[PDB]
Amino acid sequence: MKGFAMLSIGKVGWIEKEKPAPGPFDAIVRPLAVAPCTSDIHTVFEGAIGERHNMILGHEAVGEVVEVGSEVKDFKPGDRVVVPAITPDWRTSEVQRGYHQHSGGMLAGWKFSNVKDGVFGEFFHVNDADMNLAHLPKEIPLEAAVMIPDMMTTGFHGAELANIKLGDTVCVIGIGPVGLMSVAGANHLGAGRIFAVGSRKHCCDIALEYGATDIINYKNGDIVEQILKATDGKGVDKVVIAGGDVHTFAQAVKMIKPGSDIGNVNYLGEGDNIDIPRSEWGVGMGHKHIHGGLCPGGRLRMERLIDLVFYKRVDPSKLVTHVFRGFDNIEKAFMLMKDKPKDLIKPVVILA
Amino acid sequence: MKGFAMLSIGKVGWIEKEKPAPGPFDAIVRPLAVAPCTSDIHTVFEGAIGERHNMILGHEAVGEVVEVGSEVKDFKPGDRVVVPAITPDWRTSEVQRGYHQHSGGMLAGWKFSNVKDGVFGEFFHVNDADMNLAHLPKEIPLEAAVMIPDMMTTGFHGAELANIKLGDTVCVIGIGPVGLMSVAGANHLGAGRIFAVGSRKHCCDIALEYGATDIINYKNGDIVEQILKATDGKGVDKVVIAGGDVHTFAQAVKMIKPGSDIGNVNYLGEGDNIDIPRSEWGVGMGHKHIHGGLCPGGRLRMERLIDLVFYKRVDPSKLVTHVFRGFDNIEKAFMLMKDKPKDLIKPVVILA
Amino acid sequence: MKGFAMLSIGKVGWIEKEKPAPGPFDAIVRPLAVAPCTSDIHTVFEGAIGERHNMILGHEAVGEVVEVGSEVKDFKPGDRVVVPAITPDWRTSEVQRGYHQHSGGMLAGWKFSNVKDGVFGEFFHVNDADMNLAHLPKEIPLEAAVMIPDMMTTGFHGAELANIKLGDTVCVIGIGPVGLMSVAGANHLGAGRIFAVGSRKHCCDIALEYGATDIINYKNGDIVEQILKATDGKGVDKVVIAGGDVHTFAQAVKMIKPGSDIGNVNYLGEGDNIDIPRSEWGVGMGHKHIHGGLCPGGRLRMERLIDLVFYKRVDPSKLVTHVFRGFDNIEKAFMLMKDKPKDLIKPVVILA
Amino acid sequence: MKGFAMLSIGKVGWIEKEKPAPGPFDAIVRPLAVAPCTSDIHTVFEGAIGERHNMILGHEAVGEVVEVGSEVKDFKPGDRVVVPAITPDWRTSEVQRGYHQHSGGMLAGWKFSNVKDGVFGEFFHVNDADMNLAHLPKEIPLEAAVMIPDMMTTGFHGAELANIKLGDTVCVIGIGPVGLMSVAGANHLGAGRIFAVGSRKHCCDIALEYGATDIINYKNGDIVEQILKATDGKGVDKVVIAGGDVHTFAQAVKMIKPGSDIGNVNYLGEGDNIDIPRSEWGVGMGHKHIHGGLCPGGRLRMERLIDLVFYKRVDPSKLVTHVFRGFDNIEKAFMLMKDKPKDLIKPVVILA
Numbered sequence A, B, C, D: 001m002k003g004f005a006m007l008s009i010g011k012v013g014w015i016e017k018e019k020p021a022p023g024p025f026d027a028i029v030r031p032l033a034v035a036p037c038t039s040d041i042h043t044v045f046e047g048a049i050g051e052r053h054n055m056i057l058g059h060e061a062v063g064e065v066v067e068v069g070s071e072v073k074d075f076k077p078g079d080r081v082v083v084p085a086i087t088p089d090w091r092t093s094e095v096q097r098g099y100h101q102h103s104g105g106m107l108a109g110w111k112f113s114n115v116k117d118g119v120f121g122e123f124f125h126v127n128d129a130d131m132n133l134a135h136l137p138k139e140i141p142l143e144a145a146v147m148i149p150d151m152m153t154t155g156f157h158g159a160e161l162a163n164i165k166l167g168d169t170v171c172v173i174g175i176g177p178v179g180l181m182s183v184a185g186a187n188h189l190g191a192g193r194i195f196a197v198g199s200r201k202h203c204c205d206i207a208l209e210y211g212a213t214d215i216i217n218y219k220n221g222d223i224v225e226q227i228l229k230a231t232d233g234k235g236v237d238k239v240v241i242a243g244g245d246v247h248t249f250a251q252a253v254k255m256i257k258p259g260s261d262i263g264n265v266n267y268l269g270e271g272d273n274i275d276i277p278r279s280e281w282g283v284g285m286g287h288k289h290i291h292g293g294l295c296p297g298g299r300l301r302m303e304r305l306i307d308l309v310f311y312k313r314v315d316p317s318k319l320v321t322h323v324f325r326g327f328d329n330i331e332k333a334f335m336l337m338k339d340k341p342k343d344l345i346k347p348v349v350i351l352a
């Protein structure tokens, strides 16, 4: 079968691979709709998580089950499924400790396009179908559904990690697709005022649509100073980091009140260190809690997010700015994430 | 000054009292708008919290500050304010332990119409103005603003106590004004499917507007059996109790999954005991956690909720079904909570 | 093979059963040391969890692995293991939402002597060996080790559920072996003053050894009134219920401060309802949170508690008051839990 | 009156100051025993929190109340009291948000020797006596009692911030007096194995007495690799940072499991930034939560810790390695903290 792969750091292309076969608890799935992710640009071009060889890329798919192992009970060939980007091994110590994302090691719940061939292939393999797939309701269109595996779970996790309480004033730094979902997530965890820091007009407009109340752009001066002025010197209660770089944490610390939470979901692609400023972190003692976490996955997380879409709590379709057709256009869509035009949030390729 | 009071158990009427004077940290406030509460019906007619003598009723007001003590810094005469129903003494052990609602004893943060003359007077006294009052933005109409002191804080607290997580299926039992705010709260804390248990047409319609997906009317059969049928025997994830009686807890336990939370905010007016069914509670071991809590108050809670209204997260004006003009209509408005007509949710009295 | 079984409600005896065989992920284990539990008295004689027919009793064992399935990686024949009383199916929805105790339904993580033949047999079956067995260090004697599967995990869970904070004043109601572990648990979760409610001299003496500061014997007065007197009317911060009956919760509510937690681990064997007193529960609003939960199990919980014993944090050997040898004494040891002589805390039977 | 002061950065000496007078809610206290702190060395010699002019030093005292304001109810002249190092203004927004340590701004609950004349004077001022003093039981000697205001509360807070769960393997980095109390705190919060990182023999011996199981001395090699070797490559569950410098955080991240907590209580005296290593932090996504917080204070915290000492949970007397008498020895004791001889943990000066 054909797949679109990281050949090595800095190099992508189409390769031929054996079609995978399922173990007793697994499923083979063919993609119906897929999307590319900024994360794959960090992995391939920055070597952010080390060298790889002929690794099929992609970790955002809606699919059709085509084969199941003998012990799969809840899925059968023909079933349309939402495939989470995180598909843990559920029988590990990390799961017993409450961190399925790190099942088998740090980040190891994230298999596709990290430590396993991803979804940009004629077929792909899902470990533990019954634990790691969700049925797709017919009422949710493919374009919307493909935002669930990663964009929605990750953006919402940013809000979760930021420990948002009812009425909190929140700043989301970074309003690409993840950060837009963090704006939506903050709104769905009861935030009051929501600042969104971004620069591209279309992303700022969609941030308002998802519940941002204040757009903060760099043309009006230092963004920390703008947020301090806007809050009468008080700062914000909670910060979500959904973009930027290793230096964004310093900005979050400077804009946030003592006794607070910074929730990072950005994959940091370069730089040896994240710098936390000593004085503004209260010389070690300001209770400015710092969190940074990989998104939840598995069946239940998907079912929860599916319900949010089904019951019209969140409409992730606004993230999808470009749609193409056909296997060949996986390459086109991927290259769009690399050189992002000013109108891009997320591309989707429909295969069926 | 005139006030509308609990004369003793079973008896209300107009009385004359001395106008209060502030201590150094206090404010005297004149009401601009007030509302009556079901809780005062429990207190007066069921004697649910003991005997009282000539206690001015009411604990829901927006007002104008008319006098402040010498040590008040943040409020001045002329300021329009939202007055929380709960106005704690902030310098107590219970505050140091994190429970301002019980500062000075169980329920003792709730002063107005519990242990102190309430807001149905020409003036009323607010202890610790700087800690208890919040500024009212001019943009919020009086009718909406007077839903903030009690209805919003209490309904939202039901959702908070219910430990709602993203995508949870929630049942709110009781959709009077508090329950309607619990539906809104559940929506704002990331609930997916939301069942609302009620039978009055107008209340049920407003529940849908606040985010209820399913209305459960007891006239169509045992509400527990309806919810189990609707959830294919699985039950709901979390329950808010915002109405009913001491027997409602058993219903909550029977409809909820093991490993779950029941958040009560209903003031229970009668009955020796709340009965929790042994077998359905997992013979002591089902992790069906039971919570019951007085609403938060103080300045910060009010400011948080004012932000939710200001930034258009929640519109509590839908609760207001009757608007009366003039101080004398307090009596008429109160007597409507006693004999609840089917089109009533909450009355408001706007003062001259 | 021979096993000691519940024949039906009210009847026990030795029976012959099929020696179990393991699936690919399971182990067959022979007991090296076992103990009987009060819970099996509730199940057999009170019918507390329904009828059973020929169900081998017991759920507290250290064993020797004798056979493993083809997919078991971490355990081999000959390995000495601590077997948790709770051995969940790890691939369920309840596990994905953080409640392994209820995997597959309420209480369903507790298999042995609930929904599966227990450990009082020549052999028994452990589902998912790699997730549900822990290696026994040679330095821990068998008599101590057999307190880990249930007594330590349950008693400690009571303390966990009680949400103990450093310096809290705690009351543990009931000082059988579980309650003695709750006293120890409270001590290792930072309690200051610890009241222990009991009246049997040897249990009271052991309670002092595990950290109780005050013994509360009902013969000296109403236990709630004693605790109120001792705390100058303030009550206790947190309560663990580890014994008593359905009426013990009312005592906990009456002795505890508003804004608090009651952690129940007692298996309630009789009575329709647990009565919560309406007035002393703050008429629905006192923030007296009520918890009741089945003990954790699985491998990781066992390893954690093994560490507590190995590193000399807790010595559970003090619970063991009778040591017998051989299968012939399982029945004797079991009947001691039915008819509790005054010197008894927990018997252990060591097998050849 | 005389006091021992920071004259300016790098300079200390005795100065004359006006004897303070109390407001209505305050007390004037004369010290009976005091201790110096490493924090004052950072403040004076490193200029860690900026310039000061004639600020009396010291924030650890047991005292005799000599004067109270007219509104003080619970304290009177003659009363012996434990004075917390943190004495918040309790009537602030930060208190309503649950962070009394930051009442009136970051670190502003810590007044003595930060933003207020400290305890190394003939008298000192305590704001809000009823909220910020605790009675000293006669059964606790002065030397032990003077460990409660800062060493116990801080060290225990490190363990609290580290989110320790029963049986967790913990590493405490730094075993000066605060770190020794973190060891004791970890022990009290249910830790299993406890590593203590330190090299001064007497501190290491005392660490074992407080519950450390393993001493890790940097002279034997990279402490991270020592910990990885000891944990079979698994890392520790939780880390407390109670010493070191800005670079210690990187060590904590490298030794800890994904899905974990680092609780810092070290006052960081120099260095612009705390560097968090990107790769070992899971490229932003490892769930290695970072906390850094000022100790709790006020009356309730002191009463909690007094109970821990009174009921013989923790004996802080082992921290006191040097006792002197008289004001003339405050300077000597202070200079011990700068030049740390090998036998020093904490000095105490008894004044009465």
Ligand SMILES: C[As](C)(=O)[O-]
Pocket (backbone or CB within 6 Å): A037, A039, A040, A059, A085, A086, A110, A150, A154, A267, A294, A295
């Ligand atoms: C699965 As990801 C690190 O791209 O959110």
Ligand SMILES: C[As](C)(=O)[O-]
Pocket (backbone or CB within 6 Å): B037, B039, B040, B059, B085, B086, B110, B150, B154, B267, B295
């Ligand atoms: C202040 As109330 C008990 O009526 O929510």
Ligand SMILES: C[As](C)(=O)[O-]
Pocket (backbone or CB within 6 Å): C037, C039, C040, C059, C085, C086, C110, C150, C154, C267, C294, C295
């Ligand atoms: C496993 As049990 C309910 O006896 O603690």
Ligand SMILES: C[As](C)(=O)[O-]
Pocket (backbone or CB within 6 Å): A285, D037, D039, D040, D059, D085, D086, D110, D150, D154, D267, D294, D295
């Ligand atoms: C009050 As301190 C910063 O020395 O622990």
Ligand code: NA
Pocket (backbone or CB within 6 Å): B087, B088, B089, B090, B102, B103, B104, B108, B109, B110
């Ligand atoms: Na109060």
Ligand code: NA
Pocket (backbone or CB within 6 Å): D087, D088, D089, D102, D103, D104, D108, D109, D110
């Ligand atoms: Na302060």
Ligand SMILES: [Zn+2]
Pocket (backbone or CB within 6 Å): A037, A038, A039, A040, A059, A085, A150
């Ligand atoms: Zn991605």
Ligand SMILES: [Zn+2]
Pocket (backbone or CB within 6 Å): B037, B038, B039, B040, B059, B085, B150
């Ligand atoms: Zn009310």
Ligand SMILES: [Zn+2]
Pocket (backbone or CB within 6 Å): C037, C038, C039, C040, C059, C085, C150
């Ligand atoms: Zn048992």
Ligand SMILES: [Zn+2]
Pocket (backbone or CB within 6 Å): D037, D038, D039, D040, D059, D085, D150
């Ligand atoms: Zn200090």
